Design a protein around this ligand. Structure first.
Ligand SMILES: [Cu+2]
Ligand SMILES: [Cu+2]
Ligand SMILES: [Cu+2]
Ligand SMILES: [Cu+2]
Lengths: 79, 83, 82, 83
């Protein structure tokens, strides 16, 4: 199954480097990411992903199952 | 003078006590920040586009500080002062 | 009192729908941070809007978007102040 | 020359035919359009930042056409050719 997906999460940046590195390990899955600096400590990120829905879960696992990542949510949009 | 601005730049996410520093200064100045768009342009390089809002002088000074970090390339500020 | 992530899919060529979505968003521009738009296919757009403010106001605003005829896959993640 | 580019511009959202044309052109050139960030800067005006990818001739021709529409203001292009 192919399609798009939306992966949102909150984290304390002071981890930011690890998450970007994690996304690049799957960068042909990534379309773009929106980042909002919600307070001095916390970041809100929303990554839009495109491709195989199995690759998507692996991306989401690598990000969401990390310590420090909160409020994770994956929405899949299969074709 | 108030307004908006678009600050863009490219950096290497591995060479990244820099990555930590870029996000850290945005947070120190988060009153200026609206939102940032990040595109992974290849395995090594990140394009970031930071939309800023506030006093154009403060925006300029902030942007210069970001661009002056070793490893930030293609640093570019487009100012949109209020009409 | 918090943030939220509003995400939805719609057909951009639907003139009344598209006009209504952006019109509601501009009426509540004070509750809006920024929106990411990605083109899904020839017909369909994916938008992700980050919202900020009172959770009541933010939810009512999101409901006004999601209730529009033609908005698909509408989803709201509320992120109340911690 | 392949690469990326950052195209930014401002327009009034009440110009519905202009708005529809901007998005329809992005979908027409879907290969060129990566993603777009939109900020509702006030009740009337929109700021959009489109990230583009492709041949720099194609990207610049696309940007010209957007900027050439009456009602598009503050049109700006930053070209990032492949390094
Ligand atoms: Cu942040
Ligand atoms: Cu990156
Ligand atoms: Cu679209
Ligand atoms: Cu707008």
């Amino acid at each position: 199954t192919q399609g798009f997906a939306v992966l949102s999460y909150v984290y304390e940046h002071e981890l930011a480097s690890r998450i970007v590195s994690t996304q690049h390990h799957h960068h042909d899955l990534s379309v773009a990411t929106l980042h909002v600096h919600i307070n001095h400590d916390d970041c809100l990120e929303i990554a839009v992903l495109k491709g195989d829905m199995g690759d998507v879960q692996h991306f989401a696992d690598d990000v969401i199952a990390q310590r420090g990542v909160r409020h994770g949510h994956l929405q899949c949009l299969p074709k």
